[PDB]
């Protein structure tokens, strides 16, 4: 019974809520209230070791206060999310990365890059662009869909293994 604390970040409308509920409750939600920010807990087994996951889903609006910086600092690893059919959501990735280091006092932080909505045929971001960005940052890249549950478990479990190489 070790514990892990994970955070999901990314532009509005990319699928942060839908990915989390898939992991916790195993069903899909066609739309969800974009203002609601919540935390969840689950017990899982990864490589034989039993452990508890806490997951923070972020929402609301852009604000910077000294309390929010403590609420976020608590997290041990982060999932950057973008949607494959939304080019602007892919450029925002840089902004999110720099804010994270500003509150973690380090260059080395466990992160994974998530390309969501792979069930839709109209790609506007090819797969090579995403691998080049990920190789520059030194982190893994995963493609997922939350409408079919393809890749959901893999994404979260990869982050957990990141947090272990750290220590």
């Amino acid at each position, epitope marked *: 019974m070790t514990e892990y604390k994970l955070v999901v970040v990314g532009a509005c409308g990319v699928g942060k809520s839908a990915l989390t509920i898939q992991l916790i*409750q195993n069903h899909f939600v066609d739309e969800y209230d974009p203002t609601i920010e919540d*935390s*969840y807990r689950k017990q899982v087994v990864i490589d034989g070791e039993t452990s508890l996951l*806490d997951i923070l889903d972020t929402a609301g609006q852009e604000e910077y206060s000294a*309390m929010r910086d*403590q609420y976020m600092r608590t997290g041990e690893g982060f999932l950057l999310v973008f949607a494959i059919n939304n080019t602007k959501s892919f450029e925002d990735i840089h902004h999110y990365r720099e804010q994270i280091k500003r509150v973690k006092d380090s260059e080395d932080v466990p992160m994974v890059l998530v390309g969501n909505k792979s069930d839709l045929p109209s790609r506007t971001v090819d797969t090579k662009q995403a691998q080049d960005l990920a190789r520059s940052y030194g982190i893994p890249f995963i493609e997922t869909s939350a409408k079919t549950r393809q890749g959901v478990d893999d994404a979260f479990y990869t982050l957990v293994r990141e947090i272990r190489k750290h220590k």
Partner: antibody
Amino acid sequence: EVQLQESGPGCVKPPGTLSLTCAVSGGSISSSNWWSWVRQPPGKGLEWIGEIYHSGSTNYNPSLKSRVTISVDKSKNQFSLKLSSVTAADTAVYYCARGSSSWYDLGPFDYWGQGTCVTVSS
Amino acid sequence: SVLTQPPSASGTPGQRVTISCSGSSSNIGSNYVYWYQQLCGTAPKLLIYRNNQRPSGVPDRFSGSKSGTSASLAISGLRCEDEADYYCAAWDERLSGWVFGGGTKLTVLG
């Protein structure tokens, strides 16, 4: 933010059973938090009644433990209270609250309802 | 009530005031203390958590302390904004429940 609104009958004849309901908005009943009932007799200090967790675990105040029951309804985003064998000593304002977060602990009562008043009389 | 508080306190504007709350080894001894403020006709509001930390929107005039089985709340630069009820709270390992103090009405003189 989460919003909490309690409802119930304002008057009860003894020896009936009091019933109360709290409806949750702006948040999910299935998050990692504990849901509490607290009461305040008129002109006196606060008293804690009990807790429930979304998977059905409960703690009760040892002095009331034999009269209290609390329950969760997943399908409506609500939780409720029953208190049997009421007497005049149970006249109070009742509040529903949320707290004890597993992410970052601020204590037992982060958010409060506006409260409701119950009078027990013949 | 299981924790003990003095029923009242008072002071003149601008001076400092102090409130106390006493308990036992099963509660204030072992665990953290939390403080709540209530204005007449409304629900309570958090004020100090985990002995001495302020949530967002609480001025720097409020500070808290814990020592042995006792706790304390200090207020400085007293103003009419502060006339309220105050409660301490803690968990109790012998009962498995949250316990409250009695409450303390603060009054502003002059």
